[PDB]
Amino acid sequence: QQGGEVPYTTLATRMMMGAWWLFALIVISSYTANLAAFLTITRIESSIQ
C-alpha cells in the first residue's frame, strides 16, 4: 500500500493492477480479521483447579 499510484499507461498492465490491488486488500483484511479471532479465542479457558 505504500507505493501509491503506478506510472504505467498500458491497458493490459492497468487491467492486471486493478485485480492485483483487490487481491492485496482482501488478504490484508483477512489477516487482521483472523488475528482478532485468534486473540479473542485466547485469554479465556483453563481447568486445572
Next chain:
Amino acid sequence: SLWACIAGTVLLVGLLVYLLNWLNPPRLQMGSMTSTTLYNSMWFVYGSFV
C-alpha cells in the same frame, strides 16, 4: 447482490463526475489528460476506492 451493487456504483459515480467535465470544467492545465477520457474517469474513482 451487494457485490454487484458496489461494483456498479463505481461507474455510476465515474459518469456523474464525467458530466462535470462536460458542463463545468475548471481552468484545467491545457491539453492535460485532466480533461479526462472515460478511462481516467474510471481510473481515479477506482484507484481511490482501493
